[PDB]
Copies of this chain bind each other. A is one copy, B any other.
Amino acid sequence: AMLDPLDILTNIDDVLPYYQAIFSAEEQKVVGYEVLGRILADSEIQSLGPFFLDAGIPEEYKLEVDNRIIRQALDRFLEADSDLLIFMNQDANLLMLDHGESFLELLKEYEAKGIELHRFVLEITEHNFEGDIEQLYHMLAYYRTYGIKIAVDNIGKESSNLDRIALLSPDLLKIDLQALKSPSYEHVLYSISLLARKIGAALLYEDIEANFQLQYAWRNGGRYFQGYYLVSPSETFLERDVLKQRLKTEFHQFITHEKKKLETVYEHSEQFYKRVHQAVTSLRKNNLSSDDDFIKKLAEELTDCSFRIYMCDEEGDQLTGNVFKQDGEWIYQPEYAEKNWSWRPYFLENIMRMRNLRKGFFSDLYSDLETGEMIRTFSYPMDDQMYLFIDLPYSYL
């Protein structure tokens, strides 16, 4: 039914490369192309994808096929726009058979012909590589001295290891959104983008098929985009501005969606600090020496929109019980009035921030330690080196 190894090795002259355009967030333009293996068989252009991913095929015959596709690709690039990036898949297991010399030579051959080496983006999967990371790293680090870029593919799929990835110090991380097709996957992208920001790697999102995938990509550090939604593979290079208009309008909308969401959260914060300021000022006029009193009085005076309320000093010591709210009613929890919270990620920073601003503010959304529901906590500066804290549920309106 489908292609046989022998169908390809017999018809090696029919083999050709295809190209898929990669687009940028910056200029919403064609930044480069991925070179893909193809074959014209029985009046049909079909994929060499499985052929290269088949372990039954002797490796020497693979190189001879890949060699032809690459030489054609790079010939196409010679007579095109000289700043285009060239995205190529290479098997690191196959590449190591000679320490990547013949491949580097091939690339070195094209530099002399007219292609700067820094245009080459070499796509690789670290979890398919057997043998020492240190041995591979030095090769790629030697590769890097010529400006050859290293992309790492299929992040977090089978034996994917963030530590071995970070060490390879890649120029580019390739992310597919297949495990998105579901609440928790956006935190994964969020953490990845921040990691990539620290280690100095750009994010390319691939296999973008629908509009929501492009949005998720754009709002999680995506610098480069690829997929059917943008452009399918073809044997011809496209105009560099094909999708400029489409994408310019689509990004403006993302920008606008994101700005509004920030306005809302800020608006609700200012309109919450108001409710808390009035209550704090109106009740700190009455007998509540022990701070434990004030809390259970404050919890009642908020519009049934609290959760947990407690006070701390500048070194994170809780000198107040908890006033937990379950089923729209109070609970007093003296037990917690002896804990240190300086270990919590942003705690100390906030205390400091509150002595400068002299204003309250919300944290970002995070999972509540005891319940597990998404919350924000409002921090309020009290008189005499003290700080009020208010845990606050979803707002899943």
Contacts and interface: CB of A to CB of B under 8 A. Distances in A.
Interface in A184-210: 184-185, 187-188, 190-195, 197-200, 202
B169 A164 contact: no
A325 B179 CA distance: 43
Which of A158, A160, A338, A341 counts the most B-chain CB atoms under 10 A from its CB? A160
A262 interface: yes
Contacts of A315: 252, 255, 259
A262 B223 CA distance: 31
A368 B338 contact: no
A160 B199 CA distance: 16
Interface stretch (A10-18, A232-240, A342-350): A342-350
Contacts of A222: 343
Nearest to A256: B315
Given A162-B162, A200-B368, A221 B190 contact: no
Given A195-B187, A367-B200, A161 B158 contact: yes
Interface string A22-34: 0001111000000
Contacts of A164: 156
B167 A163 contact: no
Given A161-B161, A266-B356, A367-B199, A194 B156 contact: no
A21 to B, nearest CB: 18
A162 B156 contact: yes
Interface string A165-195: 0110100000000010010110110111111
A333 interface: no
Interface in A326-375: 338-345, 348-349, 352, 356, 365-369, 372
The count of identical subunits is 2
Contacts of A263: 352
A25 B202 CA distance: 36
A254 B26 contact: no
A186 to B, nearest CB: 9
Given A198-B367, A258-B348, 19 more contacts: A25-B342, A26-B341, A160-B161, A163-B185, A166-B188, A169-B184, A187-B198, A191-B194, A194-B345, A199-B367, A200-B366, A202-B369, A218-B342, A221-B343, A222-B343, A251-B340, A255-B316, A259-B314, A259-B352
20 contacts: A158-B161, A160-B161, A162-B162, A162-B192, A166-B184, A166-B185, A166-B187, A167-B179, A169-B184, A187-B198, A188-B195, A191-B192, A191-B198, A197-B367, A200-B372, A202-B369, A223-B343, A255-B316, A258-B348, A266-B356
Interface of A: 25-28, 155-158, 160-164, 166-167, 169, 179, 182, 184-185, 187-188, 190-195, 197-200, 202, 218-219, 221-223, 251-252, 254-255, 258-259, 262-263, 266, 314-316, 338-345, 348-349, 352, 356, 365-369, 372
